[PDB]
Design a protein around this ligand. Sequence first.
Ligand SMILES: Nc1ncnc2c1ncn2[C@H]1C[C@H](O)[C@@H](COP(=O)(O)OP(=O)(O)OP(=O)(O)O)O1
Ligand SMILES: Nc1ncnc2c1ncn2[C@H]1C[C@H](O)[C@@H](COP(=O)(O)OP(=O)(O)OP(=O)(O)O)O1
Ligand SMILES: [Mg+2]
Ligand SMILES: [Mg+2]
Lengths: 899, 899
Amino acid sequence: KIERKFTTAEGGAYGGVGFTTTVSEIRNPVFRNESVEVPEGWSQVASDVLAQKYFRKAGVPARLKRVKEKGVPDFLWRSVPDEAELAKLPEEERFVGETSARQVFDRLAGAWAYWGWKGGYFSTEADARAYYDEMRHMLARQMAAPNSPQWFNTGLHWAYGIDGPSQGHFYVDHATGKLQKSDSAYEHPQPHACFIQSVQDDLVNEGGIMDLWVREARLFKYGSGTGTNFSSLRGEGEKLSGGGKSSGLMGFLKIGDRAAGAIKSGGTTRRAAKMVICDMDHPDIEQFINWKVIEEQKVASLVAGSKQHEAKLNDIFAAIRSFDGSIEGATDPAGNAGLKTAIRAAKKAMIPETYINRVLQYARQGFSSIEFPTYDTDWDSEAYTTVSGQNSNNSVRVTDAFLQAVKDDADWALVRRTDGKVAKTIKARELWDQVGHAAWACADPGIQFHDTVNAWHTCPEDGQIRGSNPCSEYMFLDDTACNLASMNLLTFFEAGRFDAEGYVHATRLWTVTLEISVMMAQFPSKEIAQLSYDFRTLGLGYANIGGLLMNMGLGYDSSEGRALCGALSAIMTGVAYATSAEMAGELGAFSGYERNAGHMLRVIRNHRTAAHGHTTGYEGVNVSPVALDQVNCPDPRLVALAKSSWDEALRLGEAHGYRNAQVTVIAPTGTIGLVMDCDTTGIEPDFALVKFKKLAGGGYFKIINRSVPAALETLGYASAQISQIVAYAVGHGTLANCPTISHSALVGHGFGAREIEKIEAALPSAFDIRFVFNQWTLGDPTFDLLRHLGFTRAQIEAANDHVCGTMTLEGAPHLKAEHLPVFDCANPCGKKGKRYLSVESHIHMMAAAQSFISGAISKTINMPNSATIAETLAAYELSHSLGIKANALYRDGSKLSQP
Amino acid sequence: KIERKFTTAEGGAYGGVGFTTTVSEIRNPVFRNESVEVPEGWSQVASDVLAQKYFRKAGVPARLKRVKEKGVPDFLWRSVPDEAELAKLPEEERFVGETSARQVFDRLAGAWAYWGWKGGYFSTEADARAYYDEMRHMLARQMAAPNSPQWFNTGLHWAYGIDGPSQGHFYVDHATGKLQKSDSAYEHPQPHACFIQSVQDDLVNEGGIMDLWVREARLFKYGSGTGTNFSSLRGEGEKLSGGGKSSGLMGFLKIGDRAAGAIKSGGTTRRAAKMVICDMDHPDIEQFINWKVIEEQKVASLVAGSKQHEAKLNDIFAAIRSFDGSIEGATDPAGNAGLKTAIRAAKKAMIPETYINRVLQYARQGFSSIEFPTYDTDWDSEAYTTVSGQNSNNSVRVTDAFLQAVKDDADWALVRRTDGKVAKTIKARELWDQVGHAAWACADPGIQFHDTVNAWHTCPEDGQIRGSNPCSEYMFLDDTACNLASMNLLTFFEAGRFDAEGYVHATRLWTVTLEISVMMAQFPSKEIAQLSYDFRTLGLGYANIGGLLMNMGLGYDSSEGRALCGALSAIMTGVAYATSAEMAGELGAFSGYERNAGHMLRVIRNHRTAAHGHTTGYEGVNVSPVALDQVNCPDPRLVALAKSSWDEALRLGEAHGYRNAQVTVIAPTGTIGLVMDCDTTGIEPDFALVKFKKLAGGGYFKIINRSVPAALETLGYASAQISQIVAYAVGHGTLANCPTISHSALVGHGFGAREIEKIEAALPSAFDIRFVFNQWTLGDPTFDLLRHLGFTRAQIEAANDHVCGTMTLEGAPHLKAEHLPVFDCANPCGKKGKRYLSVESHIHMMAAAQSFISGAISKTINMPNSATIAETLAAYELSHSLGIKANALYRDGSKLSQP
Ligand SMILES: Nc1ncnc2c1ncn2[C@H]1C[C@H](O)[C@@H](COP(=O)(O)OP(=O)(O)OP(=O)(O)O)O1
Ligand SMILES: Nc1ncnc2c1ncn2[C@H]1C[C@H](O)[C@@H](COP(=O)(O)OP(=O)(O)OP(=O)(O)O)O1
Ligand SMILES: [Mg+2]
Ligand SMILES: [Mg+2]
């Protein structure tokens, strides 16, 4: 079942990979572990996130002993502290924290193999030995990684003896199939990063509104995210059986929003991840669309008003203080003309008369001034915690019918939830307008295309897909969990070849492990435990496709680059489904499959019809996906492999079905992308060609984007000119080679024992005017303006581009113009660099990938500050053109916290 | 057991009480039932509250049939709809609503007697017949009434067949003693108005923070209030086992506060009643004390800032609009000097640069102005719903040690909840200062005296008394319910005699029924059901003691009036305890009594030591109560009865114990006082001597306070002079008898066919200047100022006092100066009336009553706007002087909503 392609049998643990140890610390202008062992190629920040957030910091026993279990192999036995050996050492060092990456690599794959074995997944013991070896190798060289909950939880009870009580958690016994209540907080890992949760139009019973906040709080405590479609909640003013009428959807959303703000996700600095989705026909949707817009207005008022009070109250207190006579007359606006002026100013600034009256009654008691805190517009201001809507991503579900109504300028009915009658009729175009402006003002609402989501839904018999997770990549039925892992697409690219069969080997074995994590997990709800057991969704993904594309010498907006993406998307998902189909053959499909086979192989078919590049022939899809482009793919192998693995994936599917109702999902990889040293996260392109790497010392050093020399290696450039181009962008750090301001030109003036001072005071490289401190030198200094006299300001900026670098490859020597788009990034590089990738470039590759992905693609498109509301809606409409399931926008410098 | 003192056996249903029917409607500048049958003496507003909020409005079967139960008496059988008879009538009128007061009187006492019988409370069937008859009679003539939940719930399933499903509710089977889950939403009444609820320092498990909001929501849905001491919640920054640290008490309080704001109590307009209490040694108490102070500042900023934005955004849009040229230059602050001025003004008014930038980007898209809602300071403004802390009464628990520390100027340690270590040390005096200022600025925090509460705690073995209900009258262990009912103290006063033995008969039989309501009730929690079964607390109270005092001719600040109060307080509680002791003899004490007997008879003893008027000899009390004043009581009978019934109450207590751990409590009677036509609510004095009675037509008519003629009857005044004094205060409504502006004086000028126009255009009586409309008359009218020429303005105001009344008895003819304090009210009467009752007058009678009350006394003292912070703290300190358990202050015109 499992074979070996990356590891040996003899050095199989870590076949020839080096190790080093670094210090990792964080302190404010607080944490430090002086020995952090990692693979040698690991960056400083990769070692940082590993120690700071993945290492089990306390309670690790210093000496362990295996626990032999009858029927499970030798190397896979659970381990418990050996107090006979710990009793030797002092109690200070009996229990410590993790210190090395292989500790975590071992506990992760050990737990995976241990559970996978007792689940009978591997048919041999050599396969388990191989799977164990192969897994830790892929982790060690940053080839793939599970979502963070796996990193800090799974293997804790298997490798060490760590245990503890647990309440309200459940699992399905893989042997019996019976639902059970978990009694260990660790024996069953909690490996799921997020959950889609349902809510019923009910206040106080299970599955209801108030109980949802308990369910969301349970998730937030351990660090998981949650998402929910709230549209079943009856609108404001809708009749309730008992007598009165409901307060409405917005009122309860504000409860859970305020609850989310108070629970630190995992006890950490981290915010709680929350997704709030409402359907467009909901009666209160107009309140929902403009929720963050209004609250933002309240923030702005909160700070304009608070500072107004502070200023004019100080003026009133000054007028009372500066009064000749008693306090009784000082505080009378009649007798005190100056106080009357200060109140006149206060009233005209809309300071309420009521508060003007109380500062007066303050002063007669004998008070000099009152504490009146004012607020700022910065992120940390209490004003943001005062208003609502700040603790959730808000998105609306739009159906194709609504988008038909805006193009027809038709009417749109908002229908009551209680009786199905029409509460309101509004032009669809003004509703679409509200969405566009709200997303132009603040980030939200995001948008998800209901009909596109459900056209690819594998199990509609058990309900519609109504919601998603906080980053909108996992889309399945309510009360199911996201089970995620992503691969570094760049680790498969040696010389100029993409290790294709090592890639298919990668997805196959990670499809296996993600399956084991469904088997081994406990869950925060009885229904979530039962459902994930019954459907076994997986979310395998990838990152560093922006970095890979650049490394192989292809641009992000190139048509060949998008065809490549759609290829590797098709291959990973195809093999994953085929792998799960093999799992269903040797173990049985998920219990919800038999009633859903008709639909699941329909979407499987549609995937295959797209790998063959067909224009038409799609069964029951609303927007035909963008087919696998055969012609521009920069390798005929991968297209032929995408065709073959999808062909078989259907064949085994007809044979046995599938062990899993979903397989693939593209996450943001916001933090696991850091520990894998991914140059680009998720599906994103790169953002710059000169970066600032943190290194072992703790400082940040300016470096060339490592993909730029590699790109200049895989095209036709020699090593002489690659360092020429690199020197152009990053700079030379010195004036020894600078043409315009040379040393010789410098000593033209009284310079001599002042050059080495300049020459590496120059490598901080902050676009230099470093000619500052020397007094003695043949000189009074006014302010900024002794820019040194003799050279043109063009000579200075030419010298600046020389030492400090242009930070772009535009204007670089020896670079052919046809090879310029290959270095385009999401933002202009350097200061008068002007090239960047289009909004449409982002969208069109999401499309190219979405056609071969079970769920959706995490994405928030950054748009220029100059963007208009029409362009905003155009982006949404353009996404719907190409079978996109969800999208989200943020315009540069939209929000109030932005300086 | 039960004997008859108010009703006959033959006309026992309603022995000679008349009935009438009124219309009751409410419409905005919406509800109307044209036939509302009530007892004839019932005021319009009493009939209003009965129909509008107590009548079961729908689902009442038009024809009922009894259901014969073996072993229960004839007249007490449950009733169910008789569909054999309803099938006759059309389905429009098969099920209707209640229409008459006797319907509710019958279902209340019928359910009381039905459950009381099957509980074996009455030893005869004649006693049940008597109890049934006596109960409905006391209700019919407004003698006593249970709290509102009893009015609209109990008897619904007994008298009519109304039923329905119910979740999450529990009761203890009175036969088995086993806890059971209620399956009927109506068979067991939900008669409890409020609950004290516990909370554990835990997020997501039962009894924890998030689960509390579910428990509070359950209460709010049916209309009950809740209170909780939150101090076990660990302070902000306190370490949590897992790793991080807690967000703190204030964060979670804001969750439940926001949750309370969204749940309409009972589905109605009514707000949810919520009590939030924190201990003074809590680390976050400073945030708690100033919670409403800061949020109020945010409201003021919210509206000053919002209106600022509206004004200056309009100015910016005006400057863009009034620009000669393109929109591209119109929106450039450089090219557009006028726009630069408007931004200059906006920036100096602290309008954030970020929002100034977005209105600019608005305008270039082609927008004339943006919706920027501004807020008001009035009660209904969204600003109040934006900020936190608005949905709860907040009070702090202070111990005697803290009050020792302010008088010693000692230090005060705020101790962590997790480890008991000191988090902070602060001078007690500045903490006391913060409390005083916060309560001087806004109403909160109220204050409860922990040690005074627990010195009178009957069952300390089962924990301390930590909290209370929203109006602070019910004080017992956590997770118990308030079971309340109050008596109209005035209904017992015929001629000049107080029907004393009818009063003792009243409390005895209402102590019985409140006991039955503990027996028959279901509860919102398993622990609340078990505990209230195990301790069976009762909260019997009274109202209309202010009206009674005035009727018997005694002033509120008189020492004789306070001695009277302390008398009737002692008698009611003494008989109630003695009654419950008799119940324990024939039925057994509550299960929690045997372990607590040592303490319960200690507080029982202390009560007796006070009825005998002892200065000293109190066991384990922190502040000795104010003893029953023997000398100034205006009746030696009641003092002798207070002594005797308390003497026996202890004797039966030693004999059998008590069926109930608490008996008496003085509630606000805010609405049941209306249906009982109580002139004064709870313990409050009256507020005016001229009132405005709503009458059958729906209009409001100016009337003399009915207690003023009665007071002038029970002292030595004749019927000639009582109408003289009445005419002085209410007015004459006519100028026929007016000395200063007579008819003869009027016709002195050209008046003739203009007098009858004046003479009852004069009885609206709005302090008249009714000389308005006539043109033709021997006359141009400038504005206000044609105050009619000929008379002095003193002649006019003399005529005004004649027709419109002085609305006070100050300056009234024939009234002896010694009899003036008898008419003092909580507010000055009329416009240059100046007498009113002291803050100390309120406090000293709460004291006189508190010594003979199991719980506390609902109270928020209204203080003059001119009050100082020192006076505020002085009132709190003065309350602690006399054994007050709780107090609350509100200064006239403190809050922002006050015009
Ligand atoms: N007191 C209340 N104030 C405001 N909204 C309320 C209140 N009670 C219920 N709601 C709202 C919340 C949801 O929108 C919906 C839930 O009502 P709830 O009674 O809990 O559900 P239900 O399924 O029993 O139906 P129904 O409301 O018809 O009795 O009504
Ligand atoms: N993620 C969180 N963010 C903020 N406060 C939290 C968080 N988790 C818990 N708290 C606060 C809420 C209460 O003050 C207290 C409850 O912690 P919780 O873990 O639920 O209780 P516990 O009794 O299990 O103890 P401990 O916190 O020591 O594990 O800590
Ligand atoms: Mg309801
Ligand atoms: Mg904890």
